């Protein structure tokens, strides 16, 4: 009936707009990527910096933290995904591996394990790699527009992505062949995320609507909309239990829609520019966000 | 309470050190200015950037980052060539650059409408209304030759040129033909109409004439950056 939160904490030190953000499996630490080129690892529980990686290329659009909590992947408009060490015995963060082969700007990346990774790019394809040798093993194709999101399902065997054409497509990693496609939206996707049970998955759009789909479904479940809002959506998220949903908006604001309530509730306001990313801890003790105003305001 | 001792030691050793380093690096970060470059395939943008770099790249097979310096103020310029033709998404990564360099092929009248549409889209884009754009027109000498030969006359793509008249603002160059100036400033006004009709004070477009061989473009970009920052300062220091 009503939802509200305050800016519990704030992270300061980034010198430009934050484009990406990701935690680690250990919820106390989180990665952050900014156009300034710094992949700062912050100690969340004490709002402290623990590392400062100088990225090779300033134009970063992605950032990922390995499930083991050691390796961190970074990349963006340079068409390359780079890996670094954090828990190495040398005591200094250093490059471990670099992945190359895409023909478009890197859009998302996600670790599968300590020795594997999956990624999506703006060349209308997704790829799977081996960390040990840095070689491809399966490439995914079938979209028409740029791909701009990923959501590795908890059953990592399957994953889904959204594109700039009116379609979102599913791929099974070991088989490398598309097996479903939905097309309801009119102005197409910018983000996607999965449900803990894995059957349903959310999605953002350029038109002022959020929509839902499910694996068992061959139909667009629904679409949320508000009459007075024109701008688009920029990201999504889920709850620890998963029932409740959320998203980020273009007009310097968030807007919390819920599927179970099926209607919106409140807003997280306080940024003075676009919100470009979101995220929650693996344990759900805290929630974070990023913005083009360079503050990862962490909310109560 | 050895846990508290370890926490204090880790905090003191790590955060102080790396935050001192971070301030040191921020000092460098502010002093450096970053600019985006745009242009058509047949435009001279690659040649322009190469000339500036020679006047004094950080990547290949992707972003063609470049460095240059003027008046001991360090600059960065970025050319995104490692992407397919669709622009509407990756373009907004540059919403915070000081300015956007926009190059057009004025001799290629076929693309003049395409470049006009692209410039319209850039000018009215939600995330670029606050970012000044620098306009560059090239292959100007070919315009007179095209008028003489008329393989694809100006009127074929813009009949407004026939009814058009040279403006009082016109400043024909010393060794330049007048009617060629008429047509050249005519296309300039074609773009400036888009610039001004729906523009606002929070935006500006600076036209300039040049061929790729000209080295002054770095200083022009520098001076227009000065102008942009000066207006942002007027707004910031409460003079407006």
């Amino acid at each position, epitope marked *: 009936g009503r939802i509200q939160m305050r800016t519990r904490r704030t992270l300061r030190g980034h010198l430009a707009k934050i484009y990406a953000m990701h935690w680690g499996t250990d919820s106390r630490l989180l990665v952050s990527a900014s156009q300034d080129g710094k992949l700062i690892i912050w100690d969340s529980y004490t709002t402290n910096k623990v590392h400062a990686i100088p990225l090779r290329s300033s134009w970063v659009m992605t950032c990922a933290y390995a499930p083991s909590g050691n390796y961190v992947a970074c990349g963006g408009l340079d068409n390359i995904c780079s890996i670094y060490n954090l828990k190495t015995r040398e005591g200094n963060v250093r490059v471990s591996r670099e992945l190359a082969g895409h023909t478009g700007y890197l859009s998302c990346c996600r670790f599968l394990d300590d020795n594997q990774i999956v990624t999506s790019s703006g060349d209308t394809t997704c790829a799977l790699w081996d960390i040990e040798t840095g070689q491809q093993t399966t490439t995914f194709t079938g979209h028409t527009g740029d791909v701009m999101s990923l959501s590795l399902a908890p059953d990592t065997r399957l994953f889904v992505s959204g594109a700039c054409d009116a379609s979102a497509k599913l791929w099974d990693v070991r088989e490398g062949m598309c097996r479903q496609t939905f097309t309801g939206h*009119e*102005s197409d996707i910018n983000a996607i995320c999965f449900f803990p049970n894995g059957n349903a998955f959310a999605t953002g759009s350029d038109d002022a609507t959020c929509r839902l789909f499910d694996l068992r479904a061959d139909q667009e479940l629904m679409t949320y909309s508000h009459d007075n809002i024109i701008c688009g959506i920029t990201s999504v998220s889920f709850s620890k239990s998963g029932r409740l949903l959320l998203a980020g908006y273009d007009d310097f604001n968030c807007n919390v829609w819920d599927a179970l309530k099926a209607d919106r509730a409140g807003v997280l306001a306080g940024h003075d520019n676009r919100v470009s990313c979101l995220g929650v801890t693996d344990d759900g003790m805290a929630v974070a966000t990023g913005s083009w105003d360079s503050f990862l305001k962490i909310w109560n | 309470t050895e846990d508290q001792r370890n926490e204090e030691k880790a905090q003191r050793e790590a955060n102080k050190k790396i935050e001192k380093q971070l301030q040191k690096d921020k000092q460098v970060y502010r002093a450096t200015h970053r600019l985006l470059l745009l242009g058509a395939d047949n435009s001279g943008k690659s040649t322009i950037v190469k000339q500036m770099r020679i006047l004094h790249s950080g990547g290949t097979s992707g972003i063609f980052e470049t460095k240059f310096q003027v008046d001991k103020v360090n600059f960065h310029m970025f050319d995104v060539g490692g992407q397919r033709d669709e622009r509407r998404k990756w373009i907004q990564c540059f919403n915070d650059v000081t300015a956007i360099i926009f190059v057009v092929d004025s001799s290629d009248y076929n693309r003049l409408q395409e470049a006009l549409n692209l410039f319209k889209s850039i000018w*009215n884009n939600r995330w670029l209304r606050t970012i000044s754009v620098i306009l560059f027109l090239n292959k100007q000498d070919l315009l007179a030759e095209k008028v003489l030969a008329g393989k694809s006359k100006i009127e074929d793509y813009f009949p407004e040129f026939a009814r058009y008249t040279t403006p009082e603002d016109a400043t024909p160059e010393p060794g330049e033909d007048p009617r060629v100036t008429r047509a050249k400033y005519f296309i300039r006004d074609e773009f400036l109409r888009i610039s001004t009709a729906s523009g606002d004070g929070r935006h500006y477009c600076y036209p300039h004439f040049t061929c790729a061989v000209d080295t002054e473009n770095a200083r022009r970009i520098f001076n227009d950056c000065r102008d942009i920052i000066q207006r942002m300062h007027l707004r910031q220091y409460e003079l407006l």
Partner: nanobody
Amino acid sequence: QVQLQESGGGLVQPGGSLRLSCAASGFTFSNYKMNWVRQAPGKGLEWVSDISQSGASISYTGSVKGRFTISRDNAKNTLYLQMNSLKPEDTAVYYCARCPAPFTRDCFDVTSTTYAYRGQGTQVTVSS
């Protein structure tokens, strides 16, 4: 599915013009910007006159200026075109197209190859 289907075409000659009718379906018509776009033998894509949202404003380029009749109608979700001063150059696939986002003047990629939001088009046989 988001699609724009065109109808009308065939026999044409100098001094004689057909009527081009477009059928937008499964997509909100008024609030989006509209515009034609053509492709002809031996050349790529070319821009054509537009009509703003709710049919407010119009624009043209030189080759087409003052010789074709652009218009939009909410009663049929259609654009219209009738030709004057017809030439063999009229032969082309008339892709009924629309801009990617609503309530905006941005139409970045309508001319882009493999652009999603455009129709199949129809052809006219200019002959004499």
